[model samples]
Target: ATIRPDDKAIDAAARHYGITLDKTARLEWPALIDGALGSYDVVDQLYADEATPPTTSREHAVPSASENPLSAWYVTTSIPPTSDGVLTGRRVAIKDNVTVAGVPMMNGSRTVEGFTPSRDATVVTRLLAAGATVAGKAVCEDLCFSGSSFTPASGPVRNPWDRQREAGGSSGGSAALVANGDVDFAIGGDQGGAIRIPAAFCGVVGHKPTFGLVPYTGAFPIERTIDHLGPITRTVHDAALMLSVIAGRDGNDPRQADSVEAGDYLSTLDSDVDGLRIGIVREGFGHAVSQPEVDDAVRAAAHSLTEIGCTVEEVNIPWHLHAFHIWNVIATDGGAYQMLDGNGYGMNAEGLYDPELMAHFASRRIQHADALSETVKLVALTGHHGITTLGGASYGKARNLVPLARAAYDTALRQFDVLVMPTLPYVASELPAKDVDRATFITKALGMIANTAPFDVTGHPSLSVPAGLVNGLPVGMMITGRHFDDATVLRVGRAFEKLRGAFPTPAE
Candidate 1:
């Protein structure tokens, strides 16, 4: 009886493989089928881990709502360094989606309420090895599905500049904590515009390194192609320092094939931009919904580049206008597949699996469909509709067009050292009321990712630098450089920061 296959189980498994078994065939194959199932053990052996010493001391603590009023923290704890290096004495926060050993990682989702990883992510280990103390896990959007800060299960994160306004997400909590002086810097994850969006709204510097420069290991992934992790800091130099420490190939991540070591990025900060060609992306300046103040501030930033001996000219990449749609098709369709496969915890290539979290989401998705956030449900439904109806043809078409998009930017880069634009078309807006309608909620959540999303697709290095304040809110100027030319992007941003002098701090 123990070796026998259940008739119904065998039939279901056969149906999944699109095969049918005759009565005689099914009866004769019970022994062979059980042996095949037993052989699955060999596949599991491939995932066995080897022992390595821990890099940081791990512990966990809960944060108070009153003390952490901005809802910027998920868990508050300290992981001190094991060695002293360039980041000695620095304080940092890990975005909730990135794992930290022994800490509860909510990821701003109720489905993952009690899940905790037992090891540090590659970036966390690097931060600890560099002597930076891990302050805690900063809050993030629900599974990082929304650009609006309001979707976190912990609640909306308030902007440090204005409590009533949004902090911009899904890295909103990390940006808010850094902007409020709670941490020296933060490690933020970006798929669409998580890092730059919040950094723009919170009046800080955010760098989205060329894709694959920073390893995505141990971070919850959305889509493999567009995912990135980088620094969110108050100053360009600080971001450079953080990037230098974390930007190296960690043999475990397969995506780092195109990544090379970025040497002392701070060394090029003050390099003279004499004769540097800068292109002001004409389409970036022409968004219909863009506010005049944001355009004026970014234009002034372009003029400042000219004052420093850089040649500034207006350039257009016509296909750029289609960025939002292209991004939507790829991210939503690809991300939906991963969401279903991993049940919201996401697939991990090299780390311990959180089966509890995976199971929770898998069961709850059907049991409590309404419990999932609006954005999560939207992606699931749209992705299913696309895949089931069109057999992933749209995703394939979007991916095939990527080279054409990359070529357009590459052509422009041949004539320009870097392209300049407004990081967002508008400054941070007020957060909607808790009971706002679904359409309005989705619109506000997605509005700010337009300019930032395009670069994610092109794999360019882009940074959001606080250029100036508009109506008492900070406006960010985006500087983008060719793939693997992150050094030039950082150089341009540092020069602009120096010329602009200090920006006003948020008065919380």
Candidate 2:
């Protein structure tokens, strides 16, 4: 005979099923009354009983456990079971920027503090259907914009490698959770360098699929033009598994092309990188402030590609520097508009939001007006060298840039199988305090200076694989490919992982 379980029956059923409950949990349930109001009342009563004393005030106060309801270090579990495909029982952490039904969808804001989304994000739904357990929501910089995890509202998510250092922002919390082994893999968005920066600092694999490769629904609508969500994991294969499940088109996001077909990312993991041309942008490496160790680590990884029957050549992207300015406008404007609708606009309102949302209420006048104005100025100065101009100039010039980037990629493909570069210029730094405004901007700027934003501009697939350590901190070697060549990037990453023994696991 089969028996159904109720909220009160969970513990009893667990006991009956021989499941072990963790020692720190308490199984407190409200006395039952049969109606919906009764259920709602029970929830209120439970919170009332457990609520902690209020601490500090806004802009300076750290969120209480009751108000926040989640640790910044992990993904909050909203979807509990997997159905469509099995991900080998790997635990997954969803960035707080993604929406999950019945969970707070705050992009870490105070404005929408009590809000809960009504549905799961496309990626979240896909992962659940694939049999991966929803680990919990990982914290992010307010609105996933800050370069470091630090915020006066949410506090910094300590890096597992060294708590003194940051985990990297936007996806900082997600990267830290995955890096420290709090979960097998984490999901985070990358617009500018959100995913890659944290991945580089925290020492994990982060993939930013070619534009339009992954659906962007249920996220706190950032610059849709640049935003791409992907996986952060310890292994390339794990990332591939995640991509296989979550990468695809969903009707809700107009940016997602209807014809884009999802492929079995994991299926291509064992494919050889042989005869593939790998391009190395030497100019990309010699950043004015690049850490020496990071430079060495990047070169070593690039050299290793030669042993795998691949050809490596140094290439230069003349338009590399202009990419960030375009990303800044797109991302900031998206952030501003998303938050304005809710009447919450600015970095300070983020923590009050539901943990599952990516849109923190950033102040419109403050974030967007300035961004748009600056973009206009930059556009005039840079002329055709900007993202806004990509499709703006002569229809021919605009249309041709796509083919140009693709051609550059094809040329690289002809010479090498994968291109390699440092995920960022340096190691993770300490989290910025809310008042350190300039520091925060510089941090975000530096994070996007290399690797990530370029792909966003070029609409190419790129993967950040754990390259090893630099003075005990994790680093990543990015492998990029032409548009729609995601499989090639995955295969290259997998081959590198095989050459290297195993990824780092944080000490419990």
Candidate 3:
């Protein structure tokens, strides 16, 4: 039987595309694909290898390329013709979960292994319209669920920082490519903090825009309610640029509510935080077991925010715990629905294709069900949850949560400009006990809980900006702002990034 162009075949395509195999071992991934290796085969070849020799001479150095074909992260797709100035001449890494024409749209699962999307996802169309060259598909967790980036279908997306460490999912490969300088930036989807977690682990900036800010057609849906797709990049500005392109509403996505007709995010960069009131929920800090250095780094980040003229005050939402539960239900209920096909009509049970993700689905099915059910009960119990509370007068009291957070934010804006917090409780952790079968899904879930779960709860636009190094690894500081105040968060992040200095590109 003839072999299709797979890992080995793609390696040959890389040669056909004129990439020097030796240089492909270095920082020359772009040089090979800048316009030459124009096929998915060439791109897949790079990530499909089970293990390539290490680029660095040191032991434990990350392999220059992947080793396993099954673990191949990207789902190769076609690149549509870009309109003039569409991307301003940039290359883009579309996450595997996002639909792209001509590619097998697996969403990183075996369920959709041979399925091809007929049209681009809304974001993909935006990218093409903007003229950004489609680089290829980036890997994501199976079904775009789970946070540790592990999946039985594709294995773990190894961190470019340290192969042994995870590139946090579900947007792991998107963050990894940008962090490792394999691409300029990547699009990542987040529902319950998918984009931000990986961004923190991979030492890149990941932004989760306000819910429904970006259109979502053609993307795999984890939850129609809270799912969001955003950009992961080396810098906040890049994220902002991506948002500027993708945030507007489209006819297809009904979830996009009351979008601004026109806005140039890049034009708003100069907006200062000199008097931006930022509120820090005191409870946001403190985790069960973060490395002391990681804790210190977070404190330092908070201090830096204070120094930058943002009033930082401790506040709390009584519903904080409830928010986590709500988040869990909203996030996972969809996962269960997807996996079990509970709703007569649902996406394929692709998540079960990956044992790691399947375990997550299985575990959440049993363990998180109560939390999910309780959250649903809470939604019903609070007759007016989204817009108001029990009493007609309760609207102001309940809805005030957003405004209260914003008021606290405004107070900070008046005194200072941005609120800072730890992106997560600790630095990336080693896989639990190395037994792939025994992988602790809870460990991965808990690792993503501290920093991200809260923001998702509040609907506050939060970002994970690489803060600095901790024990020679990357540490991320989270900056959060009031709901829909994405520009403020991005502005503060850029300033903080400028002050703190830039993270280094991974070793060539």
Candidate 4:
């Protein structure tokens, strides 16, 4: 409730808004203001009491080190299936960034350690309805900001392939768990390739479903425009099955457009890929940090489609280079405003808002801002500077350019149904030391996103599937399809899986 305005408060307001106010005007306005705001007190109470918590009883707890070999689990819970459908007897891990009723979700930060979600995300409800058991929560990058697994406050999420190496990104825990067969499937969030990057590094299938195809209603968001949550699993069929379970409108997410539609992804996997045209993007390889072996492996994988009756050809879309800049501005400004300043739910949105989450996170962040990772700190600093100095013009510019970026890829998509790319420039690197330099920290966090971030911006469905192994480190080839054609991407993945035969997994 707004307190009755004093002369000092009225004076500050006038000066801040560039209105000239003398002593007479400042003193005269308090009573008039008080009269205008008299009805608001009741409205505020209604909203305050309207913050409803979930009624379901869920039991959860953190796992011991012995139980969490890769530090992949944040908390393990045993919620049985509510009904049997497509996912009967399967177990699913929810990313720490996604809400699960009554479970603690740190999102890989110390600041939110004690905060438990009071409602299940729409995806969680769908999973339960599909008869999937809620296995547990998987760790993620700190506030889902970094591209490497080391930034999580709990500890580095180790790559099961080699414990010393990185597990590509924000969805590292999700991918790692799936790679190790710790869970049947894991749901992951993607803003800047979080889902695809980890899948590439950890040797699994990660699908960043077409933007707005899956409801992001209860996921902790980075930016409304770029936020996405999809499946990370050991097999292509699992990703398709998970997508079929979670995709579609939940009526509470404004980010979902009327065009969003869920397909029968599970049934369509057996469809032939005959006559499908695959475009291998020229710019997706040979980056400054890219390894020749990685590039060659992806190229060979793309060319292998010929045996399955699919045609592969090189395609050029020069705008692929500017994807990071466009994504950066949108994520920086929007992330800072919505997550940091707005306490995880920004204003001017039509959706569900959790008042308790807002209150607790807001209180905790004030006390522990310094505890944030360097990656998160840098974004917060740059975003604050942008807001204070440039007034979000850069964010607006990037958003205005979003359609152009989408159409640039769409124009190429006209000649081909799906585009192919090297998912990462190189294999996973060694984890940074705890006392590493700032440059090392930031660079390692974002070094692998060049090939993947563009799809997030363009709202295309991009899947990271195992291409082959280079010196025993798995490589991923990204297959991107037209919006809402996730079925075809999955089909391509299945075809490849069959052709490749037996994908390797880390020893249990």
Candidate 5:
């Protein structure tokens, strides 16, 4: 081992780290360094040269301009199962962040371009095993970091309802594909409001399962503690059905525990809501960004619950507003340490690791740092500042506040079966121009996640069901419940569907 450094090198290192290494100590250190590092020689010998992982190749092709007018399809593909189950004949649009062996996943970033995974993600395996065909990769916001649809590397995923408007993101493509009737349902990942945000904008049903209820083994994550994978569909029943297929302990993800209570939600999805108590959180309304029509629409939807014999009361959860503050710190600091600096997947927790994907993202990220979206660049600036100047104290304290936030919700949940609020303060916004000013661009992208983020940190099940239409655009009402009570949320979602008859799906 070439452990010894020249005198000039010794002086540089000592000055850089503020170490006092005299001539005698420096001479002694080289031998000690070599002695300790000699262990790596044995480790190198023990590490096997493993074979390339197996790939279940599927038929895929780049979509043409006409076929992908909305830019929803990253790549179109078909993957059929060897053993068919309930999902037979059903097709699903897999969000690009989730790997499908032999198919390329860019996660809406140019950094990961041309990288094809050799092994299927655990969720893809389960979906295929259940007989669902992999339709294609749906576009996501750059690194799934932005909430607006415009940040995807390919382009904005246009709203199906109105092409000029945004299909709210970072799961916008999944929602648009479902809204356009391209698939039976789509699989989307939510670290913030991604899954539900798009579903709200597209007038579809989106569920954010209880954290650790659904295995997140395969998706590219923003932050491990808040990451979730859930279903986006047109019906609560289908959301329930998809949940049954994808949710469970896969033994690979550290996020999922054995106590995860995953089961078929359809059995109780249509259960009577007669005795259900709904708390309409007073703090969730009248935000600075809240639109009167959107707030009124949700309140009207709440009134409908009373007709179904359910009790609807206005309750205050002050922490509901403060929850977003915690989300900002964790997302910025944790994301900087875990995602931006740690490659697509973070470190320290046990789970499956994809060497190819990580290697691809790691190299490209460094090489093309300039290509990062503005939103992510902002995260980088704030996150690194927090990490270097203050260390992880802010990150740890924000994480510590999760239980107190949970307790606040749990106290209300004990008295109420579910909590109701507007999924977003306003409906889908106009897609901003590519040359828009940085301040305006960042504001539009970060403005919509206040209500949805709290539950993401608290590990609660939350569903977004279309409330009604405003100015020809759909509004969404969120129904959230205690941890492991996803079925109750579905029950309320289904109940609302009946009360409203049917939401207007975008005309193809």
Candidate 6:
């Protein structure tokens, strides 16, 4: 018996291409395709397995939710460093979204229950090689779709300073852990201020490097264009040290096309800021939701810069106010399309796939969608509505406007070495009760990102340093430098840290 092609399928394909295939041609196509496929078997024979040893020896340990009162850690594990380098003897906790070979990755989402990556992310490899010990995987927002600590499926990540308050997110766990002294430093992802938001709330230092400076391979993606992975630490020095190890092209991330060579971040960290020109972004202080205490703290930080012999002046970018609308279109539409389609495997970067997540999308039911948080549902529904009703016209328009926004920022950067702003418009809010209205929950969850999100769109290197406590709650001062000028940003942050002295950490 001979194998036969489905006649209906053949006709449908021919019709799709507006081509007419005779009955005989349809009958002959299967054998011809089979013969062509058989020729590719030799290609498979060329492949051979190689023993790729683990970079660090590790043993997994169960994380106790009780001990992790802030719900900051997903799993506790020990992967000793491979060699003595800059990060030697450092204890690091990676956000759950980043892959750790042999460690279960939940991404703070119950949908991805049984998935564990078998390979390390490029940043993880660099950290291990630099002699950093992998302490554990910190919790993240559910599917990293929200900018609120309360959205994590594991439970809300509380602020180390005030347990009843939020830690911010989706990197809230990383910030909470560091602030609580559970880890020496941590790595977190930032699309729309995931790292900076948490850092601001937790009184830590978070850096979102210039796009392409750090390869994003091995981490779960939100929006490829704006997605970034960087360090969230208690001090600027540690963050710069981590950046030195992690920033560089890893050849796997397609987004690293414009990445520059990594520099000695630690060496230049303490460089003098005298004669440096810093701009206070006027729009950052003008947001409708901006609080006087947050604005006052950040302005005081700018004045502190002037005292150090740096010239500080106010600069305005009219288009900055429109960033949220543009970002919403790109991130929600772009991210939704990617996640719904298995992270756009072949269309974007090649990386790990979560089958369970795909299955959840396939069988979504509004009444039974207990696993998905309100924020995730909002993004999904909004994106789907945009796609179906507008055929992605808004996304296309938003993409086109990105360069204009970048140009506006570039214009400001020429005269200013770095731009300064409040990392958040307000201090960390108290976690809303679980039974609150969905609209209220989402509004609170996304309120802090306005100041930080614009830079993600512009691809500038942005750092959030502890400005001071506002009413006993931490506020962050954001310093944004021109693209690929991460070293300067770190230098500026170091200067501020020196002037400000050590910030207070939460009581153990």
| Best of the candidates, lDDT | 4
Query: Best by TM-score, which number?
Result: 4
The candidate, 1 or 2, that scores higher on TM-score is: 1
Q: Which residues of candidate 5, in runs, are more than 4 Å off?
A: 1-52
Residue lDDT tens for model 3, 1-508: 1123344555676776676556444445444544454565564566347323223111111122443222324543336446855366677888887767555545665554445444567788788888787777787876665676665245567778787777887788888878777678798988767788889887899998876678766676665656678899988888998888888878667566665443456776756556556555555566455666876786777566656666556565344444555555444444444433332114432221122223334444344334332222233334324323223333334333544443544554455345566776667766443354322465454446655765554566778899877876777888876556688788888877766776776573
The local distance difference test score of model 3 is: 0.63
Q: Candidate 2: lDDT of 123?
A: 89
TM-score of 1: 0.92
Segments in model 6 whose C-alpha atoms lie over 4 Å from true places: 1-58, 344-370
Q: 4 or 6, which is superior by lDDT?
A: 4
Higher TM-score: candidate 1 or 4? 4
lDDT (Cα) of model 5: 0.88
The lowest-lDDT stretch of 10 consecutive residues in candidate 4 is 47-56
Q: How far is candidate 3 from the true structure (C-alpha RMSD, Å)?
A: 17.3
TM-scores, each model vs. reference:
0.92, 0.73, 0.71, 0.94, 0.93, 0.88
lDDT of 1 by residue, 85-197 (tens): 98899899999988887788877877666767766789999999999999999999988988879999879999999889999989999999999999999999888889999
**Model 2: per-residue lDDT, tens digit, 1-508?**
1123465565676676677656433233322223434666666567457542233211112345653422454224434564746674667878877766655544654443444565577888888888887766777765555555664135677787887777776788788877777688888988767777888888888888878878877776555556788889877877887888887777666667767888767766797778777788765687776787887888888878778877777887655554444444444433343334333222332222222233433333235333322222232234333323343333234334545655655665566656778888777776544556554455443444465776675677888888888888877788887667788889988888887767666563
State each model's C-alpha RMSD to the native. 3.1, 16.1, 17.3, 2.4, 2.9, 4.4
